[PDB]
Design an enzyme around this catalytic site. Structure first.
Site, PDB file in Angstrom:
ATOM      1  N   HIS A 162       0.848  -1.173  -0.136  1.00  0.00           N
ATOM      2  CA  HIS A 162       0.076  -0.045   0.029  1.00  0.00           C
ATOM      3  C   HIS A 162       0.926   1.191  -0.091  1.00  0.00           C
ATOM      4  CE1 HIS A 162      -2.437  -3.410   1.868  1.00  0.00           C
ATOM      5  NE2 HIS A 162      -3.497  -2.599   1.277  1.00  0.00           N
ATOM      6  N   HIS A 176      -2.858  -0.589   7.056  1.00  0.00           N
ATOM      7  CA  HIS A 176      -2.215  -0.975   5.618  1.00  0.00           C
ATOM      8  C   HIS A 176      -1.076  -0.043   5.289  1.00  0.00           C
ATOM      9  CE1 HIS A 176      -5.644   1.827   5.398  1.00  0.00           C
ATOM     10  NE2 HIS A 176      -4.951   2.354   4.157  1.00  0.00           N
ATOM     11  N   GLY A 191      -4.089  -3.456  10.879  1.00  0.00           N
ATOM     12  CA  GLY A 191      -4.580  -4.330   9.867  1.00  0.00           C
ATOM     13  C   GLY A 191      -6.176  -4.409   9.891  1.00  0.00           C
ATOM     14  N   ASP A 206     -10.180   7.052   6.605  1.00  0.00           N
ATOM     15  CA  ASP A 206     -11.729   6.881   6.150  1.00  0.00           C
ATOM     16  C   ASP A 206     -12.120   5.576   6.862  1.00  0.00           C
ATOM     17  OD1 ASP A 206     -12.328   9.534   4.836  1.00  0.00           O
ATOM     18  OD2 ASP A 206     -10.560   8.641   3.414  1.00  0.00           O
ATOM     19  N   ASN A 217      -8.521  12.275   2.871  1.00  0.00           N
ATOM     20  CA  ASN A 217      -7.877  12.208   1.645  1.00  0.00           C
ATOM     21  C   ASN A 217      -9.316  11.739   0.349  1.00  0.00           C
ATOM     22  OD1 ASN A 217      -8.160   9.129   1.760  1.00  0.00           O
ATOM     23  ND2 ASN A 217      -5.959   8.900   1.763  1.00  0.00           N
ATOM     24  N   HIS A 219      -3.954   2.962  -3.716  1.00  0.00           N
ATOM     25  CA  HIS A 219      -4.385   2.366  -2.192  1.00  0.00           C
ATOM     26  C   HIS A 219      -3.563   1.127  -1.801  1.00  0.00           C
ATOM     27  CE1 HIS A 219      -6.287   0.514   1.325  1.00  0.00           C
ATOM     28  NE2 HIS A 219      -6.459  -0.425   0.426  1.00  0.00           N
ATOM     29  N   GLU A 228     -19.153  -3.634  23.458  1.00  0.00           N
ATOM     30  CA  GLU A 228     -18.345  -5.036  23.281  1.00  0.00           C
ATOM     31  C   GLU A 228     -17.110  -5.123  22.739  1.00  0.00           C
ATOM     32  OE1 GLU A 228     -21.660  -4.855  22.552  1.00  0.00           O
ATOM     33  OE2 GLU A 228     -22.786  -5.622  24.145  1.00  0.00           O
ATOM     34  N   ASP A 272     -34.609 -15.146  28.448  1.00  0.00           N
ATOM     35  CA  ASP A 272     -34.292 -14.149  27.333  1.00  0.00           C
ATOM     36  C   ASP A 272     -34.291 -14.909  26.208  1.00  0.00           C
ATOM     37  OD1 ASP A 272     -34.457 -11.880  28.809  1.00  0.00           O
ATOM     38  OD2 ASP A 272     -31.899 -11.781  29.297  1.00  0.00           O
ATOM     39  N   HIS A 290     -30.315 -14.571  22.931  1.00  0.00           N
ATOM     40  CA  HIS A 290     -29.279 -14.393  24.052  1.00  0.00           C
ATOM     41  C   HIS A 290     -28.358 -15.688  24.585  1.00  0.00           C
ATOM     42  CE1 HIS A 290     -30.988 -10.659  24.652  1.00  0.00           C
ATOM     43  NE2 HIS A 290     -30.302 -10.182  25.669  1.00  0.00           N
TER      44      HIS A 290
HETATM   45  C1  LIG Z   1     -25.515  -6.343  21.753  1.00  0.00           C
HETATM   46  C2  LIG Z   1     -25.986  -6.624  23.155  1.00  0.00           C
HETATM   47  N1  LIG Z   1     -25.339  -6.179  24.182  1.00  0.00           N
HETATM   48  C3  LIG Z   1     -25.940  -6.371  25.501  1.00  0.00           C
HETATM   49  C4  LIG Z   1     -27.136  -6.421  25.878  1.00  0.00           C
HETATM   50  C5  LIG Z   1     -27.700  -6.635  27.179  1.00  0.00           C
HETATM   51  N2  LIG Z   1     -28.564  -5.547  27.417  1.00  0.00           N
HETATM   52  C6  LIG Z   1     -29.979  -5.551  27.124  1.00  0.00           C
HETATM   53  S1  LIG Z   1     -30.733  -4.170  27.276  1.00  0.00           S
HETATM   54  C7  LIG Z   1     -29.255  -3.500  27.628  1.00  0.00           C
HETATM   55  C8  LIG Z   1     -29.086  -1.807  28.067  1.00  0.00           C
HETATM   56  C9  LIG Z   1     -29.691  -1.068  26.997  1.00  0.00           C
HETATM   57  O1  LIG Z   1     -30.613  -0.024  27.809  1.00  0.00           O
HETATM   58  P1  LIG Z   1     -31.372   0.971  27.147  1.00  0.00           P
HETATM   59  O2  LIG Z   1     -31.363   0.284  25.551  1.00  0.00           O
HETATM   60  O3  LIG Z   1     -31.011   2.185  27.320  1.00  0.00           O
HETATM   61  O4  LIG Z   1     -32.904   0.303  27.152  1.00  0.00           O
HETATM   62  P2  LIG Z   1     -33.977   0.693  28.639  1.00  0.00           P
HETATM   63  O5  LIG Z   1     -33.232   0.110  29.764  1.00  0.00           O
HETATM   64  O6  LIG Z   1     -33.713   2.209  28.786  1.00  0.00           O
HETATM   65  O7  LIG Z   1     -34.980   0.206  28.067  1.00  0.00           O
HETATM   66  C10 LIG Z   1     -28.186  -4.276  27.569  1.00  0.00           C
HETATM   67  C11 LIG Z   1     -26.712  -4.035  27.851  1.00  0.00           C
HETATM   68  C12 LIG Z   1     -27.952  -6.851  24.716  1.00  0.00           C
HETATM   69  N3  LIG Z   1     -29.324  -7.173  24.673  1.00  0.00           N
HETATM   70  N4  LIG Z   1     -27.304  -6.719  23.505  1.00  0.00           N
HETATM   71  C1  LIG Z   2     -12.246  -4.554   9.462  1.00  0.00           C
HETATM   72  C2  LIG Z   2     -11.482  -4.323   7.927  1.00  0.00           C
HETATM   73  N1  LIG Z   2     -12.320  -4.423   7.091  1.00  0.00           N
HETATM   74  C3  LIG Z   2     -11.663  -4.193   5.731  1.00  0.00           C
HETATM   75  C4  LIG Z   2     -10.425  -3.960   5.293  1.00  0.00           C
HETATM   76  C5  LIG Z   2     -10.161  -3.985   3.995  1.00  0.00           C
HETATM   77  N2  LIG Z   2      -9.622  -2.479   3.735  1.00  0.00           N
HETATM   78  C6  LIG Z   2      -8.197  -2.281   4.061  1.00  0.00           C
HETATM   79  S1  LIG Z   2      -7.969  -0.518   3.854  1.00  0.00           S
HETATM   80  C7  LIG Z   2      -9.587  -0.069   3.159  1.00  0.00           C
HETATM   81  C8  LIG Z   2     -10.093   1.044   2.894  1.00  0.00           C
HETATM   82  C9  LIG Z   2      -9.741   2.110   3.783  1.00  0.00           C
HETATM   83  O1  LIG Z   2      -9.564   3.389   3.194  1.00  0.00           O
HETATM   84  P1  LIG Z   2      -8.896   4.251   4.096  1.00  0.00           P
HETATM   85  O2  LIG Z   2      -8.680   3.906   5.470  1.00  0.00           O
HETATM   86  O3  LIG Z   2      -9.625   5.694   3.811  1.00  0.00           O
HETATM   87  O4  LIG Z   2      -7.356   3.807   3.328  1.00  0.00           O
HETATM   88  P2  LIG Z   2      -6.545   4.928   2.326  1.00  0.00           P
HETATM   89  O5  LIG Z   2      -6.425   4.084   1.256  1.00  0.00           O
HETATM   90  O6  LIG Z   2      -7.227   6.374   2.061  1.00  0.00           O
HETATM   91  O7  LIG Z   2      -5.233   4.895   3.111  1.00  0.00           O
HETATM   92  C10 LIG Z   2     -10.242  -1.510   3.365  1.00  0.00           C
HETATM   93  C11 LIG Z   2     -11.919  -1.768   3.031  1.00  0.00           C
HETATM   94  C12 LIG Z   2      -9.576  -3.957   6.721  1.00  0.00           C
HETATM   95  N3  LIG Z   2      -8.370  -3.844   6.313  1.00  0.00           N
HETATM   96  N4  LIG Z   2     -10.051  -4.284   7.768  1.00  0.00           N
HETATM   97  O1  LIG Z   3      -5.177  -7.739  -4.632  1.00  0.00           O
HETATM   98  P1  LIG Z   3      -6.334  -7.976  -3.665  1.00  0.00           P
HETATM   99  O2  LIG Z   3      -6.064  -8.961  -2.592  1.00  0.00           O
HETATM  100  O3  LIG Z   3      -7.372  -7.718  -4.321  1.00  0.00           O
HETATM  101  O4  LIG Z   3      -5.955  -6.669  -2.651  1.00  0.00           O
HETATM  102  C1  LIG Z   3      -4.794  -6.527  -1.912  1.00  0.00           C
HETATM  103  C2  LIG Z   3      -4.804  -5.407  -1.001  1.00  0.00           C
HETATM  104  O5  LIG Z   3      -5.210  -4.171  -1.864  1.00  0.00           O
HETATM  105  C3  LIG Z   3      -6.036  -3.469  -1.445  1.00  0.00           C
HETATM  106  O6  LIG Z   3      -7.339  -3.386  -2.395  1.00  0.00           O
HETATM  107  C4  LIG Z   3      -6.698  -4.243  -0.033  1.00  0.00           C
HETATM  108  O7  LIG Z   3      -6.498  -3.393   1.136  1.00  0.00           O
HETATM  109  C5  LIG Z   3      -5.989  -5.448   0.175  1.00  0.00           C
HETATM  110  O8  LIG Z   3      -5.132  -5.530   1.300  1.00  0.00           O
HETATM  111  O1  LIG Z   4     -31.542 -11.130  35.538  1.00  0.00           O
HETATM  112  P1  LIG Z   4     -30.013 -11.144  34.770  1.00  0.00           P
HETATM  113  O2  LIG Z   4     -29.708 -12.342  33.725  1.00  0.00           O
HETATM  114  O3  LIG Z   4     -28.858 -10.795  35.789  1.00  0.00           O
HETATM  115  O4  LIG Z   4     -30.325  -9.876  33.885  1.00  0.00           O
HETATM  116  C1  LIG Z   4     -31.432  -9.467  33.636  1.00  0.00           C
HETATM  117  C2  LIG Z   4     -31.739  -9.364  32.053  1.00  0.00           C
HETATM  118  O5  LIG Z   4     -32.659  -8.277  32.092  1.00  0.00           O
HETATM  119  C3  LIG Z   4     -31.692  -7.319  31.859  1.00  0.00           C
HETATM  120  O6  LIG Z   4     -31.318  -6.633  33.410  1.00  0.00           O
HETATM  121  C4  LIG Z   4     -30.610  -7.672  31.077  1.00  0.00           C
HETATM  122  O7  LIG Z   4     -30.856  -7.225  29.898  1.00  0.00           O
HETATM  123  C5  LIG Z   4     -30.761  -9.112  31.337  1.00  0.00           C
HETATM  124  O8  LIG Z   4     -31.575  -9.481  29.818  1.00  0.00           O
HETATM  125 CA   LIG Z   5      -8.931   7.330   2.663  1.00  0.00          CA
END
Ligand SMILES: Cc1ncc(C[n+]2csc(CCOP(=O)(O)OP(=O)(O)O)c2C)c(N)n1
Ligand SMILES: Cc1ncc(C[n+]2csc(CCOP(=O)(O)OP(=O)(O)O)c2C)c(N)n1
Ligand SMILES: O=P(O)(O)OC[C@H]1O[C@@H](O)[C@H](O)[C@@H]1O
Ligand SMILES: O=P(O)(O)OC[C@H]1O[C@@H](O)[C@H](O)[C@@H]1O
Ligand SMILES: [Ca+2]
Ligand SMILES: [Br-]
Ligand SMILES: [Br-]
Ligand SMILES: [Br-]
Ligand SMILES: [Br-]
Ligand SMILES: [Ca+2]
Lengths: 671, 666
Positions: B25, B65, B113, B154, B184, B259, B415, B473, B477
């Site tokens: 790259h 890259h 990467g 980007d 860029n 690129h 997460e 749940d 889950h």
């Molecule tokens: C991807 C993901 N991570 C974690 C959870 C566990 N979880 C369920 S609701 C919640 C909190 C989000 O609360 P919010 O969306 O603000 O809902 P409210 O309690 O205000 O209804 C979490 C951490 C989930 N369901 N999905």
């Molecule tokens: C999680 C993830 N998804 C996809 C790719 C493949 N990939 C590598 S660089 C790139 C484009 C990112 O463009 P930018 O960061 O703007 O790079 P520039 O070419 O401008 O340096 C992609 C899609 C990667 N490396 N990682």
């Molecule tokens: O030659 P391919 O594997 O298509 O592309 C090689 C690299 O060139 C870019 O397009 C991607 O980021 C990849 O890492």
């Molecule tokens: O009762 P536990 O399993 O600790 O957690 C309660 C459940 O209800 C909420 O609090 C969490 O989103 C989870 O789904």
């Molecule tokens: Ca770029």
């Protein structure tokens, strides 16, 4: 007295708090908080027919904060869907139509399966894109048949998840102005006051994506929410309505607290809430005037009736198109599909080309597009590298001058694997298209739970993955998959294809396109040798694992089976003559899909892998997976470490993917 | 030598190394050459001679890259990365792999990467510096003071992980984090504006960041001035550097072809001419070395810090020894005995609780002996049970920048950003961090778990709610494929303990192990198992004999986690049916696989058939049970119902174990 909005909203409160208490499990906070939002959207704006949840031109609603499932179950029940009161009594109980998080296919009116935060929002972005494409494609100046909105409820959880950034940035760039998000802005998440870990100016964030925002709306004022939706329906941008609510609103003691998110209110708190709300009815009793105010069966019938008359007028002017619309909304392939698929597989066979399977895939996509006008491809910024696009395609682009998209059939998703994938689940759910989306295999780790949810919902999303092993060469171990092919096979209901050449590729694609469950299609960067096949072998590719090279009749040499997939089939085949010069007679079983092979009957699996003949598996990925086919006594030629940055050729020699190592492994196994 | 000459040295090395490898790259490194000059040459505090200096600034290349940029900088400024290694870009065993790799190259802080993750690592590094400063610094003696620089493009900004990381970094007011955006207008599919039209400054201000928009990315003085302004900032800073991808190329700059492909020889020769770069490939003139080299400035800097640290030790002897211990990642002195006591305590109590509660009980004990312990949860603190009674929540300062010290972090619903931030915290030194969420949502954070395993750093990932046992749940889950899918990642230890004792062992092993670990716990109560002292000593071997044959037809039951209970309850009913069952508990198959052949044969003797029992996919177990053995597991998604109902409905019963055993012995 007919029902006030307060009485309509309190019915949601009562059903939610009571259903959670009955199950001793679930989430009453959000539903009680969102009750006035439910009234405003469902009773005043949502276009839908409870009698026919499958009406093509219905508005689509998504509950992204899926933990608040009783809100959706209440609205469905109250507005007249086929979800009786007994089902609400069985919240969170085995085989009920009221599982703890809503499940598509289980419950009428549930558009998608939520629970994993953030994915609903992205589904909804997909659904709005589908409406927008289907509209640009099918509508005519004298006859409109596509026109609906996409609504999503969401909370702090969805907005924190990175997927909301992927989805909304993309929706803003594509000007998807019929997407309207209602944000339950209540200041609280599971750990407490969100401000301590999430202090975004969310309105400013969404404006930066190019969305319209209506901030600071009173989420307990039906009229105000109603007015905000009406402004949103006039907007030239996707809209976010920030609805200030109190979690568990209406609860006597626990409203706004840290303890109402996800545990039952408690019997005392419910009794006090009844008195505080003036709600006198017993659990699951709804008064007549509350049903009468909510019920949507009459208005739903008028709406679908007018739409059917509109479609009839459209069919008269556009008969070929009307029939295409029906076919595609149903997700049905063309009547002569078997012929057309066979033409694609046959052409791959006639050409006998040695190419990378990513190139095989593009050639197959070319052939699919020519007979599937519903085909909708795309890539997460790897179009030219995945080879997902075709010569006659047209790229989806925002209109330059107004809202919405110009029609296209290939999408540049940006670097948004997870957002792309959940959007695809949305597109598939909406109907009208056959979508697929590409990225590198290892970055399946980014989109993983979307692949899982597709598999759970049993919808036929197609995920393309290229650069599938150390064969990708120099980009090295961050990019080279090792564990991925096996790890995807683990997900229930998710077929994984890893074809060896152009023919297996055409079969994988044509099979995937006709299958009801989702598929991962896994292709190489590097050229793979074409394999000549007999008619019998050709007929067996679609069985997932099959005999590619058999032993000669009545032979005397020690027998071995080599089971190989993808790029490793070539290695298995180059090993046959050398193994023979060593006294070993090698059957080559190609297994482009072990998932499909496992669904074959016992007689057929026994014909391919006869009991008592030993086996060596060959695949550029972790070895342990193969023990299901080779046993403790078998061998595997694979890779159990991360890779290295070097050319493919160098890597394959370095990591033991050679004829010599195959011979050695076969000899050890036969000893 | 001029700044133009310094920048063009990066251009020449990048285009020539990519041409030599015929791979890589060149676009980004050419576009970012001036930004490299401004940061590395005029602001970066670092000692090329000691990459492990505790108080160095941390640099992260998130747009990984563009690796030739970093290899160039490292080489020009005098790190131990000889020209020969640049010649071997992208070749087997070179110190210059296609994307930078932590541990492989001096001065490479993390492995990048996978787009977006570098940025999240840097958020973790800056949080590490901030916490450590609040903890160790004193009014009359400062020992912690450094910035965290991240280069990104980007791709990283499109990735959802950037939202997670930067939103958290903004709320926590991490004002020493400085992000330089290679703005860029191009990504791989072409003009980014067609798929990515964000007003990025507005987005970042919404996070609580300071933004320096519209900087000229080819004007060293301007970039330098922006970095200086950022070091004066109340908030984390994003410097938006306008650049041309492939800048400096004779004809291809700003093209859609630079690129990720070599320029080609023709283009390179012309580029040499248009730049006035007269030197042959890999030849750098001495004046460019003299302008770039940082050995002397680096030595003065670390010497000054070494003196300030000595002044700190004279006043704070005990705290100074703790600083050195923890920066080096060394465990406390009587560690073996302290870990033994934590296990012995769990054994003495003999409680039947959920392993999530066991985990919390173990955390209590670990915290009392590891002041470096740094917990947290992705908005599931009270559900994962990751905090302890004496813990203190990390919080932004109310009135100025930065954080008040604490040892448990509320990560929010992030997460993936949490997990990649944890990697950063681990790489930074000073803490023993861990983070929890539900097991199924390991899907969200997956690639960060993988990168921890690739870097071989001991990140600890806590996962609770591990099966259908979580109950109501339901299937979104309820984990089914997760345990097995994490075992497949190389170097990633997966622990799934059966009770308080296995939990204590899993935790204590994880804390002292070099590789990352997944600790997997139940929502529902699991029965305590009595162990002999010899059984006790084999828990850390990952698989061991929990109940041996009585000295009837022999079988082995291999069980993990919550299913150990079902295996143990089946022993007597199997005896009544003429089957002698040994029960092998396998809290970690990964650790078990690492034992020697004699021990493995002792636990699983050749020729005794086996049934595995685990509330997850069945195929994994074929590595141990063979074609002829049996598995009691679950190969479908779950359902929404109480745990007890699910276990019956899905065949986790004594009857099913017996039936499988008889089938196996037929
Ligand atoms: C991807 C993901 N991570 C974690 C959870 C566990 N979880 C369920 S609701 C919640 C909190 C989000 O609360 P919010 O969306 O603000 O809902 P409210 O309690 O205000 O209804 C979490 C951490 C989930 N369901 N999905
Ligand atoms: C999680 C993830 N998804 C996809 C790719 C493949 N990939 C590598 S660089 C790139 C484009 C990112 O463009 P930018 O960061 O703007 O790079 P520039 O070419 O401008 O340096 C992609 C899609 C990667 N490396 N990682
Ligand atoms: O030659 P391919 O594997 O298509 O592309 C090689 C690299 O060139 C870019 O397009 C991607 O980021 C990849 O890492
Ligand atoms: O009762 P536990 O399993 O600790 O957690 C309660 C459940 O209800 C909420 O609090 C969490 O989103 C989870 O789904
Ligand atoms: Ca770029
Ligand atoms: Br009543
Ligand atoms: Br064409
Ligand atoms: Br373009
Ligand atoms: Br026996
Ligand atoms: Ca909330």
């Amino acid at each position: 007295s007919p029902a006030s909005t307060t009485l309509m909203a309190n019915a949601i409160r009562a059903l939610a708090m009571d259903a959670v208490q009955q199950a001793n499990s679930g989430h009453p906070g959000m539903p009680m908080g969102m009750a006035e939002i439910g009234v405003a959207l469902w009773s005043r704006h949502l276009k839908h027919n409870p009698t026919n949840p499958h009406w093509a031109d219905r508005d689509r609603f998504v509950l992204s904060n899926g933990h608040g499932s009783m809100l959706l179950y209440s609205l469905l029940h109250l507005t007249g869907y086929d979800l009786p009161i007994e089902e609400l009594k069985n919240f969170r109980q085995l085989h009920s139509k009221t599982p703890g998080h809503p499940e598509y296919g289980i419950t009428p009116g549930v558009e998608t399966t939520t629970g994993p935060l953030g994915q609903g929002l992205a589904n909804a972005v997909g659904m709005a894109l589908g409406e927008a494409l289907l509209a640009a494609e099918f509508n005519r100046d004298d006859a409109k048949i596509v026109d609906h909105h996409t609504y999503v409820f969401l909370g702090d959880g969805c907005l924190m998840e990175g997927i909301s950034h992927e989805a909304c940035s993309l929706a803003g760039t594509l000007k998807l102005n019929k997407l309207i998000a209602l944000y339950d802005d209540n200041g609280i998440s599971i750990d407490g006051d969100v401000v301590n870990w999430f202090h975004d100016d969310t309105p400013k964030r969404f404006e930066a994506y190019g969305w319209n925002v209506i901030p600071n709306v009173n989420g307990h004022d039906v009229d105000a929410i109603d007015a905000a939706i009406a402004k949103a329906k006039r907007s030239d941008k996707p809209s976010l309505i920030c609805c200030k609510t109190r979690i568990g609103n209406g609860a006597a003691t626990k409203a706004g607290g840290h303890d109402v998110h996800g545990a039952p209110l408690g019997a005392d708190e419910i009794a006090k809430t009844r008195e505080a709300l003036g709600w006198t009815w017993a659990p699951f009793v709804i008064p007549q005037e509350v049903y009468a105010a909510w019920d949507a069966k009459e208005a739903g019938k008028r709406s679908e009736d007018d739409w059917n008359a509109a479609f009839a007028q459209y069919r008269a002017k556009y008969p070929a198109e009307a029939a295409e619309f029906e076919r595609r909304m149903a997700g049905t392939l063309p009547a002569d599909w078997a012929a057309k698929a066979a033409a694609i597989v046959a052409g791959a066979n006639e050409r006998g080309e040695t190419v990378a399977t990513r190139k095989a895939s593009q050639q197959t996509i070319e052939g699919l597009a020519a007979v599937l006008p519903e085909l909708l491809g795309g890539s997460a910024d790897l179009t030219g590298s995945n080879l997902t696009n075709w010569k006659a395609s047209k790229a989806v682009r925002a209109n330059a001058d107004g809202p919405g998209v110009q029609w296209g059939n290939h999408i540049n998703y940006g670097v948004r694997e997870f957002g792309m994938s959940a959007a695809i689940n949305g597109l598939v759910l909406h109907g009208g298209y056959k979508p697929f989306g590409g990225t590198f295999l290892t970055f399946s780790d980014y989109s993983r739970n979307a692949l899982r949810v597709a598999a759970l919902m049993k919808v036929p999303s197609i995920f393309v993955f290229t650069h599938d092993s150390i064969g990708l060469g120099e980009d090295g171990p961050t990019h080279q998959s090792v564990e991925h092919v096996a790890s995807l096979r683990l997900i229930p209901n998710l077929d994984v294809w890893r074809p060896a050449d152009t023919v297996e590729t055409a079969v994988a694609w044509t099979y995937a396109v006709a299958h009801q469950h989702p598929s991962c299609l896994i292709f190489s960067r590097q050229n793979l040798a074409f394999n000549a096949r007999t008619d019998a072998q050709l007929a067996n590719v679609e069985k997932g694992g099959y005999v590619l090279r058999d032993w000669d009749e009545e032979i005397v040499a020690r027998k071995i089976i080599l089971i190989a997939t993808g790029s490793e089939v070539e290695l298995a085949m180059k090993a046959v003559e050398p193994l023979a010069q060593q006294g070993i007679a090698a059957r080559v079983v190609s297994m482009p899909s072990s998932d499909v092979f496992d669904r074959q009957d016992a007689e057929y699996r026994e014909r391919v892998l006869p009991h008592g003949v030993r086996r060596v598996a060959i695949e550029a990925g972790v070895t342990d997976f193969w023990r299901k086919y080779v046993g403790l006594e078998g061998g595997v030629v694979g890779i159990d470490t991360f890779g290295e940055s070097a050319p493919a050729g160098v890597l394959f020699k370095h990591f033991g993917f050679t004829v010599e190592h195959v011979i050695e492994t076969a000899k050890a196994v036969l000893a």
